[PDB]
């Protein structure tokens, strides 16, 4: 498996598993899962009440020092009853390492804003308000950042269509750019691409 296969990094896998045990036993109040992928990335799946206690810890513990918030993300998985998955990506420049802190919410449960831990988050979770509708409590200035000012709905939800519900055109009667219910001259052609054969038997789910 030399030329074309990605070489597995076992040292980083061992170190991230050990540090994941470390985080899981320092913070048992909030940590729900700890996992390490085959390409050696550590995910710490926590309860949403511990956004501030975990992320401060990783920012301030002498064996963590995750002083950088690389990215903050939501993922909409509608079959989960807590359909939004808030993903923090942290960088420790001291220990040259990355950690992922994942948590959950639905449309109505507010996540605590992490601006007091990382100020970097100030726009990012603001984007999570704009794209997903996840509310962040105790945010300094929570409002839309990317959508238009009269925009209704949250676009990166997966029950939101690819085109919107409204589209703009200039109207010469009212002398104004106006919004109208969307009509496409060519509908977006949905392609059903998934093969009916199983691709990865290592990821086979057990039947009912």
């Amino acid at each position: 498996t030399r030329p074309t296969v990605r070489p597995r990094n076992d040292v980083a896998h061992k170190q991230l598993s050990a540090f994941g045990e470390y985080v899981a036993e320092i913070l048992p109040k909030y940590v729900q899962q700890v996992q390490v992928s085959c390409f050696s990335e550590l995910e710490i799946c926590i309860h949403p009440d511990g956004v501030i206690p975990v992320l401060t810890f990783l920012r301030d513990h002498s064996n963590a020092q995750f002083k950088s918030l690389a990215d903050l993300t939501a993922v909409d998985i509608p079959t989960r009853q807590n359909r939004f998955e808030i993903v923090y990506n942290l960088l420790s420049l001291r220990f040259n390492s990355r950690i992922r802190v994942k948590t959950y919410t639905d449309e109505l449960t507010p996540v605590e804003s992490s601006v007091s831990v990382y100020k970097a988050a100030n726009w990012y979770e603001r984007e999570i308000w704009d794209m997903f509708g996840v509310f962040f409590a105790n945010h300094p200035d929570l409002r839309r950042i990317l959508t238009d000012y009269g925009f209704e709905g949250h676009p990166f939800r997966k029950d939101f269509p690819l085109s919107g519900y409204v589209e703009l055109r200039y109207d010469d009667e009212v002398k104004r750019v106006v919004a109208e219910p969307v009509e496409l001259a060519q509908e977006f052609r949905k392609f059903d691409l998934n093969s009916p054969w199983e691709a990865f038997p290592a990821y086979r789910q057990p039947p009912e």
Partner: protein, 114 residues
């Protein structure tokens, strides 16, 4: 059934926030018609405010009406600060849109939609 609140513990505090938001919109509407130099009246903009509040009047969940007050305050903050243009304020008034057929018969005449 035990959920985490947003601002309001029940519907009384929630209706209080709805009521303060309606007060703020009612106060803002003449300034909006002036500085955007809209071609509507203050009565008409306040009727659109009342229409947007009474559209959501069927809701019995405190968290949903908390988020509705949050989004109404975001709309008002984008209107007081001149962040909307005239176009975004007048998108509430569907002026260029043709009136939809409302009865069964004209919806039968124009097409396939229920």
């Amino acid at each position: 059934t035990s959920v985490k609140p947003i601002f309001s513990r029940d519907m009384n505090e929630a209706k209080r926030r709805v009521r303060e938001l309606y007060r703020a919109w009612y106060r803002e509407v003449p300034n909006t018609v002036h500085l955007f130099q809209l071609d509507i009246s203050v009565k008409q903009g306040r009727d659109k405010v009342r229409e947007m509040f009474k559209k959501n009047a069927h809701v019995t969940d405190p968290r949903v009406v908390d988020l509705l007050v949050i989004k109404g305050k975001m709309e008002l903050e984008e209107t007081i600060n001149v962040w909307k243009q005239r176009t975004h304020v007048m998108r509430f008034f569907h002026e260029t849109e043709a009136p939809r057929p409302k009865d069964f018969l004209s919806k039968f005449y124009v097409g396939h939609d229920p």
